[PDB]
């Protein structure tokens, strides 16, 4: 059975709506339009105006209503049409949601989910290409996940809805239509993927390559290519950005002695920076036979013209090149 990332997320939301009438979905065009990228297709027809709510274009406002609905015990899924637009609402995400259970001394939980596509699209230019993983990962009181394939997406959405604290689910527009095979245990309405756990997507012994979201597939094509020359990459899909699963990255590095991180976001203070600093401060530092190095988006607002954009996002080539510098081959 092949299922696209978009359908995986949709199945996840459907199952959770069915399981718990406190769950509802709100955002721009989620209802009668069937979703801006069709993620919420069919949901309004099935659950009605009460559960699936089309909002005005008032991000701060509806993100805040959603947070308020969660404080009162409901369990909203608040969609941002892309994460670029959550900047107008980021006050509500951080100060009304992330910090509250703490400020209240554990009296006030906020079981809200924020979801939407994140990072780079194709030709949408600087205001619509921004990756927010490091921004949100920075904040205590949040959990932040960034799924890659269909399993990841369905299991993390469901974990997110089930969690009782604010969770930011950073999806990816270019992944929505990619089909994957979907083992019968993902098809289950009980399929959960725990937050805070990375997955090894490909065993290897020469180098550890860590990524999240769409570039994970690029690390897999790079590993397939390097493999024909005898170089075996252990490719790690982070899944969770906060709290990240560093332990799995450490065990891999003690085996391979080499680390390259790969991410689509801007480089400075980005996700790879944090993995490198951790690797350097943790028990695996000494096992490192070469500097940990970072593959990232180029450090520019995203340009429009095709050839500029291609050179603004990491490509398979760039991953391979960093891998070869690192293994000194």
């Amino acid at each position: 059975l092949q299922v696209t990332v978009r359908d995986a997320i949709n199945q996840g939301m459907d199952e959770e709506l069915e399981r718990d009438e406190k769950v509802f979905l709100l955002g721009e065009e989620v209802a009668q339009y069937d979703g801006a990228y069709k993620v919420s297709r069919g949901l309004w027809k099935k659950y009605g105006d009460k559960r699936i709510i089309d909002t005005p274009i008032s991000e701060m406002g509806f993100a805040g209503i959603a947070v308020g609905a969660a404080m009162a015990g409901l369990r909203p899924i608040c969609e941002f049409m892309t994460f670029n637009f959550s900047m107008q609402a980021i006050d509500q995400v951080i100060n009304s949601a992330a910090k509250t259970y703490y400020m209240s001394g554990g009296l006030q939980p906020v079981p809200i989910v924020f979801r939407g596509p994140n990072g780079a699209s194709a030709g949408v230019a600087a205001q619509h290409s921004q990756c927010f993983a490091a921004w949100y990962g920075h904040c205590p009181g949040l959990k932040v996940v960034s799924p890659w394939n269909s399993e990841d997406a369905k299991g993390l959405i469901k974990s997110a809805i089930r969690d009782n604290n604010p969770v930011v689910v950073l999806e990816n527009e270019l992944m929505y239509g990619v089909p994957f095979e979907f083992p019968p245990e993902a098809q289950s309405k009980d399929f959960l993927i725990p937050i805070g756990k990375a997955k090894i997507e490909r065993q290897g012994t020469h180098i550890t390559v860590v990524s999240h979201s769409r570039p994970v597939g690029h690390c897999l094509e790079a590993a397939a290519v390097l493999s024909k020359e005898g170089v075996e990459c252990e490719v790690i899909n982070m899944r969770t950005i906060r709290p990240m699963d560093m332990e799995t990255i450490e065990a891999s590095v003690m085996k391979t002695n080499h680390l390259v991180t790969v991410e689509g976001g801007w480089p400075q203070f980005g996700v790879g920076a944090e993995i490198c600093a951790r690797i350097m401060e943790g028990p695996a530092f000494n096992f490192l036979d070469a500097p940990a190095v970072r593959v990232t988006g180029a450090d520019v607002p995203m340009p429009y013209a095709k050839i500029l954009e291609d050179n603004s996002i990491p490509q398979v080539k760039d991953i391979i090149f960093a891998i070869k510098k690192t293994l000194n081959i």
Binding site: G61, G64, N165
Partner: protein
């Protein structure tokens, strides 16, 4: 022998998009009069004590007081049910008490001790209680939150309403207008409440000061915020309106706060001190209720002096609990970051410092 109840006149409200407002006349039973009087006094004394402990530096960071505005928190509470919901900004000590927190847990939160309602974790601006959502430090942010709580009331189908408070300075926050629009579109039972005390720190800032009309398409009424019975009737009327399914409404409360006018221009601050003294002597909320209860033979002058004495005692017991109580211990720094999760570690100031976090 005392009168069992009496009738009083209350300012007519100015209306926006309403043909009738709340009555201009109302009935106070002596029992209610006594309860409202104790409550306003308790808040007055609590805030005077906090001001004292703040100036002694025992309370830190912020300490916004609401003395002068007691008719608001006590009147609003008089017009709603324990099962209704209330959210406001940072000047929340009165509301925290009228929603059922003790003076103990409030002052001990203020002095940062383990016995605070938030365990010393929140301080002045962040206190929570049953159906009271704070206590919110980002001006304007509570208005959408309240609209959401109202959405939850509509969704639960239990006929409860949400009172959502913001001050005059907050009234030009964009998110208030986003909320007004969604509230009206979805017919949320949200009562939008502007506490108008004439200052937003220190019409320099608002093109219109007709706060009750700012919802435009949402109806609104302007209420005398210094008269506890007047607030009570308006609130009764406003909650009736929401429960009946007609969607949101605005209530502007015209009130005044005695504290937080630390202007540094000497002309302006001199004038502001005169004004404080005029308002206090002509429209003090508690004094207004007292004059009425004595004058209609609802209670005796000495009967209220007795109440003052019990209240001074409650507050004194609470102050000394709040100054003797231990601070929360260090090993609880990382507690309550997440709800319902298993224990985990949190990093301190360097990697060798680890705090356990439990839910």
């Amino acid at each position: 022998m005392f009168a069992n109840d009496a009738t009083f006149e209350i300012k007519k409200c100015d209306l926006h998009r309403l043909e009738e407002g709340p009555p201009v006349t109302t009935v106070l039973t002596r029992e209610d009069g006594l309860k409202y009087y104790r409550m306003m006094q308790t808040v007055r004394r609590m805030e005077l004590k906090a001001d004292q402990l703040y100036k002694q530096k025992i309370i830190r960071g912020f300490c916004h007081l609401c003395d002068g505005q007691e008719a608001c928190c006590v009147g609003l509470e008089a017009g709603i049910n324990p099962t209704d919901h209330l959210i406001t900004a940072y000047r929340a000590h009165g509301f925290t008490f009228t929603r059922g927190l003790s003076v103990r847990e409030i002052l001990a939160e203020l002095t940062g001790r383990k016995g605070g309602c938030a365990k010393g974790k929140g301080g002045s601006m962040h206190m929570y209680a049953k159906n009271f959502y704070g206590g919110n430090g980002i001006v304007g942010a509570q208005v959408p939150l309240g609209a959401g709580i109202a959405l939850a009331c509509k969704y639960n189908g239990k006929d409860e309403v949400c009172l959502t408070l913001y001050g005059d300075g907050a009234a030009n926050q964009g998110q208030i207008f986003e909320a007004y629009n969604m509230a009206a579109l979805w017919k949320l039972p949200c009562i939008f409440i502007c506490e108008n005390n004439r200052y937003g720190m220190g019409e320099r800032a608002a093109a219109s000061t007709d706060y009750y009309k700012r919802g435009d398409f949402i109806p609104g009424l302007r209420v005398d915020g210094m008269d506890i019975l007047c607030v009570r009737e308006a609130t009764r009327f406003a909650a009736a309106y929401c429960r009946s399914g007609k969607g949101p409404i605005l209530m502007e409360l015209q009130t005044y706060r005695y504290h937080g006018h630390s202007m540094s221009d000497p002309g302006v601050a001199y004038r502001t001190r005169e004004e404080i003294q005029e308002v206090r002597s002509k429209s003090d909320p508690i004094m207004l209720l007292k004059d009425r209860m004595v004058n209609s033979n609802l209670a005796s002058v000495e009967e209220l002096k007795e109440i003052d004495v019990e209240v001074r005692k409650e507050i004194e017991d609470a102050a000394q609990f709040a100054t003797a109580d231990p601070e929360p211990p260090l090993e609880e720094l990382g507690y309550h970051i997440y709800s319902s999760d298993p224990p985990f570690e949190v990093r301190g100031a360097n990697q060798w410092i680890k705090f356990k976090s439990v839910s």
